[PDB]
Amino acid sequence: KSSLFKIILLGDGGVGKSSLMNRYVTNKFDSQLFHTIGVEFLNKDLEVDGHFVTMQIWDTAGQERFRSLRTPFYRGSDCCLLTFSVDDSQSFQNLSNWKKEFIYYADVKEPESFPFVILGNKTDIKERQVSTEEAQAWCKDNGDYPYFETSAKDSTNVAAAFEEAVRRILAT
Ligand X SMILES: Nc1nc2c(ncn2[C@@H]2O[C@H](COP(=O)(O)OP(=O)(O)NP(=O)(O)O)[C@@H](O)[C@H]2O)c(=O)[nH]1
3-class DSSP assignment, residue 81 = strand
Query: CB under 8 Å to 125, separation ≥6 — which residues?
Result: 85, 86, 87
Q: How far is the CB of 2 from Mg ion (least distance, A)?
A: 26
Nearer to Mg ion, 36 or 150 (CB): 36
According to the annotation, is 16 in a ligand binding site?
yes
Q: Are 42 and 56 spatial neighbours (Cβ–Cβ below 8 Å)?
A: yes
How does 59-84 read in b/e, with b if 16+ C-beta sit within 10 Å? Answer: bbbbeeebeeebbebbeebbbbbbbb
3-class DSSP assignment, residue 7 = strand
Partner from ligand X, Mg ion, none contacting 15, C-beta within 5 to 8 A by type = ligand X
According to the annotation, is 155 in a ligand binding site?
no
Catalog residues that contact Mg ion under the rule CB under 5 A: 17-18, 36
According to the annotation, is 137 in a ligand binding site?
no
Q: How far is the CB of 84 from ligand X (least distance, A)?
A: 10
According to the annotation, is 99 in a ligand binding site?
no
According to the annotation, is 15 in a ligand binding site?
yes
Nearest to 82 by CA among 67, 66, 99: 99
HSE-up (13 A, CA, CB side) for residue 83 = 33
Catalog residues that contact ligand X under the rule CB under 6 A: 13-19, 30-31, 33, 35-36, 61-63, 121-122, 124-125, 151-153
Q: How far is the CB of 77 from ligand X (least distance, A)?
A: 17
Nearer to ligand X, 30 or 47 (CB): 30
Annotated binding site for Mg(2+): 18, 36, 59
